[PDB]
Design a binder for this molecule. Structure first.
Ligand SMILES: C=C(CC)C(=O)c1ccc(OCC(=O)O)c(Cl)c1Cl
Ligand SMILES: C=C(CC)C(=O)c1ccc(OCC(=O)O)c(Cl)c1Cl
Lengths: 208, 208
């Protein structure tokens, strides 16, 4: 089945967990404590010396986006054709780019950079509002009329930014409605409300 | 029916150009000068305000990795099955991570950071040598027995690092042989030796 090996935080596993939950998939959580990680052996066995580590049978994967694409590919959440698949990648790449800036702020310089980051936020979110407006008026998903792995990753990105900058989605009606709509999906709603998700910190350094 | 819109540098288009050339594909180059870019209109029309922009018929793509995955998917350079496809993604994600560090060094802190970067390089290259050793003794490609988009991206990464740190591949026999081998592919060899590639700077700020 599936096993996700990660630190006791949402971080880069939040999106893939939402995907698994919403798709009614069963998985195992292997929690890595800071003490275990600092021991060194685990880190050394990780391909790029990082987590998450993912196991699907005897297939061992590293890199959050590789895991998302793998699940999207095997679970049929990667567009209806090659054209949609490319657009899904384009959205995910954009989500990844903003995620990198977010992580840099959180772990590198939260105190000094928070204000500039928040001022620049609207410009960073606009592309996703635009994509939504060009797809069935933003009434369905980020790409096409079926959910994709990019939806889960984008949803997570939006959720964590609302925590960082409450109200950042007020200027974007499509993204706002999108978050509410996806968050309302039965299995996803149940997961997002569960202790498994709720009692885990977004990040590892206590900042959000 | 392919069109690459980019600045007059190799940068993030080097790998996809190598792919197109080696696969015997025809494409058009739309060069964007710094003056044109600074005018603002083009940038504003780009999804994430960045290049490269790619056109395949009426499909317009942004993000170098989206373009690579699109071409890999449509040209059959994405593994023989889902398992290999995941491995290809894992390699490409790793290449992207090192590329980001490389770009950061080149554009934001070349002078002061070059030494630390080069010292850390072997550790960054090791994962790729390891992947190679686990696949047919590193005699074929990075994943499986057929070329993938990840090979072109990794090859580019290796080539630009040889320029940055001559001899960095001396400690990695599989990667060294890999570079020589792939660079020897007829169409790729011809392209790499052509003015089209040779007369373009690796980066935009004159550093390499
Ligand atoms: C070092 C840590 C404890 C083992 C830590 O707190 C930490 C640092 C960076 C991180 O992500 C970085 C990313 O790029 O996602 C994460 Cl997820 C954690 Cl938990
Ligand atoms: C600003 C420039 C001229 C229009 C410039 O020189 C420049 C800066 C960053 C770049 O890549 C960044 C990357 O992330 O790939 C590139 Cl490819 C260029 Cl040409």
């Amino acid at each position: 089945p599936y096993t996700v090996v990660y630190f006791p935080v949402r971080g880069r596993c939040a999106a893939l967990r939402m995907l698994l939950a919403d798709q009614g998939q069963s998985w195992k959580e292997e929690v890595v404590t800071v003490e275990t990680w600092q021991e060194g052996s685990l880190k050394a066995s990780c391909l790029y010396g990082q987590l998450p580590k993912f196991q699907d049978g005897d297939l061992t994967l590293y890199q959050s986006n590789t895991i998302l694409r793998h699940l999207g590919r095997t679970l049929g959440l990667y567009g209806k054709d090659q054209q949609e698949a490319a657009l899904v990648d384009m959205v995910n790449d954009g989500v990844e780019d903003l995620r990198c800036k977010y992580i840099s702020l959180i772990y590198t310089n939260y105190e000094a950079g928070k204000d500039d980051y928040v001022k620049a936020l609207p410009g960073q979110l606009k592309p996703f509002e635009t994509l939504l407006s060009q797809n069935q008026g933003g009434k369905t998903f980020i790409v096409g009329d079926q959910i994709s792995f990019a939806d889960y990753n984008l949803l997570d990105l939006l959720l964590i930014h609302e925590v960082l900058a409450p109200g950042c989605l007020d200027a974007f009606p499509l993204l706002s409605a999108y978050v509410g709509r996806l968050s309302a999906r039965p299995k996803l709603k149940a997961f997002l409300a569960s202790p498994e998700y709720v009692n885990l910190p977004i990040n590892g350094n206590g900042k959000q």
